Amino acid sequence: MRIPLVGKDSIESKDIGFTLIHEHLRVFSEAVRQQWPHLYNEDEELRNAVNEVKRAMQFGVKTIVDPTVMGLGRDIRFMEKVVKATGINLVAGTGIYIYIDLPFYFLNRSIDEIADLFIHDIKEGIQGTLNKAGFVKIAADEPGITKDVEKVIRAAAIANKETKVPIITHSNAHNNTGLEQQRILTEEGVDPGKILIGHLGDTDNIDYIKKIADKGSFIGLDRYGLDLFLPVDKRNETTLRLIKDGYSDKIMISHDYACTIDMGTAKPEYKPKLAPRWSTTLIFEDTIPFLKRNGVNEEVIATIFKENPKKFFS
Amino acid sequence: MRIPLVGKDSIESKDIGFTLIHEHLRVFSEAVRQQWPHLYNEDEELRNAVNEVKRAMQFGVKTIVDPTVMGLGRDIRFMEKVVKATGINLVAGTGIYIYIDLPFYFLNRSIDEIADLFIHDIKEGIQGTLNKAGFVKIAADEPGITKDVEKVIRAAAIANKETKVPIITHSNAHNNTGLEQQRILTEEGVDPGKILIGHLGDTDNIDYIKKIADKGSFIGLDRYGLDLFLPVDKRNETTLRLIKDGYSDKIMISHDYACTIDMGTAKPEYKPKLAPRWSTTLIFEDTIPFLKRNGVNEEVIATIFKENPKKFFS
Ligand SMILES: [Co+2]
Ligand SMILES: [Co+2]
Ligand SMILES: [Fe+2]
Ligand SMILES: [Fe+2]
Structure with a gap:
């Protein structure tokens, strides 16, 4: 009993089993959903999430880690409903997902106050329940490391030091944000092995990806199916390359699938090859078979999906 | 009839009576409240709002217009509870309050889609209730007119053209944003007299304030009590000067009081004169007595608090 699970007693990290490290049961903008509930259907969202999780479990997934936090519409009670319907081990997190500035609430508030929110969710529970957070999630994107982005990173380091939960x-992938996150966190005393730097699979710049792995953190090849960021074939070649080059013990693979997401849909792009079905199981249908074909053995698969998550949460 | 009211049948605009055009029963950041409910106490918030509204009614306020919208934590059911407890005429709005970018929901979405949300709230109702919006609220601040800020302004113009509700x-006050809002809205076909340009009372630059009034819009001397923006004495002198100069028929006065607000507390500033009590009634205690004793007659007061709101909502 060391990793908290939604709707269940905590488990030993050694018992996490085959894990999907970055998937979302549901994503939404909190303010939009509060203000215009007519746009949403929780019953459909639940059905979709339950079906996705069931499909993942039939491929042998034991545990799903869901980094939906503030800014992405975290709802612990929705998550509980999915657990009740499926029996999945589900790890919920805390944290803040922003690209530029914090919500107005945080005006005149300290890094410590931010960290206290994370620690509340880890030690006391999430949203008035006894379901506790098992990791912290932070973000940066095109705008880079802004002052508020940096505040959140520093707050995550505090929470990790106090509770030992890892950071996702x-x-x-194209502007050094991941490298900066890793640097700031490690400077603040976070173990590099307690960090997953996300969305590195969005690039085929292997020198950049290796640089981060070499600094001791997991590398998130974690958006399989999102062709608009990088097509599955190029992802697969990069993943294979990294495996060939000895990086299995740093690689984490996932889809970043959002079983439902409320963002406007971007212009389709059509390529000569039929588009992979983005889902929580695409890796079982495409990536893993591809790897096996190219001589990747079962031990690599176990390393990426079992041993790496076990270490991350240890 | 014509102006929709929370928890009541609609009223004719001529019957609006003595109005506070910009007050908030409660403000919060939607995402923070959803994620960390431990920080909040709705029962305390309700008590506080009810007491403030009762005190306003004791001074003869008939109608309060509350421009809490997306981004500020609009909650129509909370508003209904305040109405039930007080009997106030309460005008709720729709709109979006942002300074930089829209929520991620709006990625890949059109100005028309944004306007449709406003029109839904005006024609159908707010948050699944039959309480309808009676105006649109928009914002700009230090970052100026960004592309997403402009999208929201243009969406407000569409909603006004379709429904005739006014825009707050x-x-x-210090960077031309109000002038820009007025210009863009009028270019899009909004009657200048259907616009209240907010927070002009935060400056003593009378030339800037008059410029906006001269272009036909109401001018919001609307933050009485918020000394950190401009002290009450300086606001009063500016208000008095505008009255002396013949601008009564463009002046709107309010406090922008937030009966509760969740933002962190800014550093105190202490001045030689005791700080006025920022509340929903400060103008009865300070401003209005000040005006009258400097020779402002009852007709000016009626113009500002009754006739101007009547015209705005006509
Ligand atoms: Co992400
Ligand atoms: Co304002
Ligand atoms: Fe994600
Ligand atoms: Fe306001």
Whole structure:
């Protein structure tokens, strides 16, 4: 009993099993949903999330880590409903997802006050329940490391030092944000092995990805199916390359699938190859078979999906 | 009839009576309240709002216009509870309050889609209730007129053209944002007299304030009690000067009081004269007595608090 689970007793990290480290049951903008509930259907969202999780479990997924936090519409009671319907081990997190500035609430507030919110969710529970957070999620993207983005990073480091939960990040693979997150966190005393630098699979710049892995953090090849960021074939070649080059013990793989997401849909792009179905199981249908074909053995798969998450949460 | 009221049948605009055009029963950041409910106490908030409204009614206020919208924590059911407890005429609005970018929901979405949300609230109702919006609120501040800020302004113009409800703005008195809002709205076909340009009382630059009034819009001397923006004495002198200069028929006065607000507390500033009590009734205690004793007659008061709101909502 060391990793808290939604709707269940906590488990030992050694028992996490086959894990999807970055998937979302549901994402929404809190303010839009509060103000215009007519745009949403929680029953449909629930059905969709339950079906996705069930499909993941039939491929052998034991645990799903869901980094939906403030800014992405975290709802612990929705998450509980999915657990009740499926029996999945679900790890919820705390944190703040922003690209530029914090909400107005945080005007005249300290990094310590921010960290206290995270620690509340880890030690006391999330949204008035006894379901506790098992990691912290932070973000940076195109705007880079702004002052408020940096405040949140520093607050995450405080929470990690106090509670030992790991940190998952969102970064932009093309502007060094991930490298900066890793640097700031490690400067503040976070173990590099307690950090997953996200969305590195969005680039085929292997020198950049290795640089981060070499500094001791997990690398998030974590958006399989999101072709608009990087097509599955190029992701697969990069993943294969990294495996070939000895990086299995730093690689984490996921889809960043949002079973439902409320953002406007971007212009389709059509390529010669039929578009992969983005879902929580695309890796079982495409990536893993591809790897196996190219001689990747079962031990690599176990390393990426079992041993790495076990270490991350240890 | 014509102006929709929370928890009541609509009223004719001629029957609006003595109005406070810009007051907030409660403000909060939607995402923070959803994620960390431990920080908030709705029962305390309700008590505080009810007491403030009762005190306003004791001074003869008939109608309060509350421009809490998306970004400020609009909650129509909370508003209904205040009406039930007090009997106030309360005008709720729709709109979006942002300074830089829209929520992620709006990625890949059109100005028309944004306007449709406003029109839904005006024609159908707010948050799943039959309480309808009676105006649109928009904002700009230190970052100026960004592309997303402009989208929201243009969406407000569409909603006004379709429904004839007026537009209230938030601006920064020191960087031309109010002038820009007025210009863009009027260019899009909004009657200048259907616009209240907010927070002009935050400056003593009378030339700037008059410029906006001369272009046909109401001018919001609307933050009485917020000394950190401009002290009450200086506001009073500016208000008096505008009256002396013949601007009564463009002046709107309010406090922008937030009966509760969740933002961190700014550093105190202490001045030689005791700080006035920022509340929903400060103008009865300070401003109005000051005006009358400097020779301002009852007809000016009636113009500012009754006739101007009547015209605005006509
Ligand atoms: Co992300
Ligand atoms: Co304002
Ligand atoms: Fe994600
Ligand atoms: Fe306001």
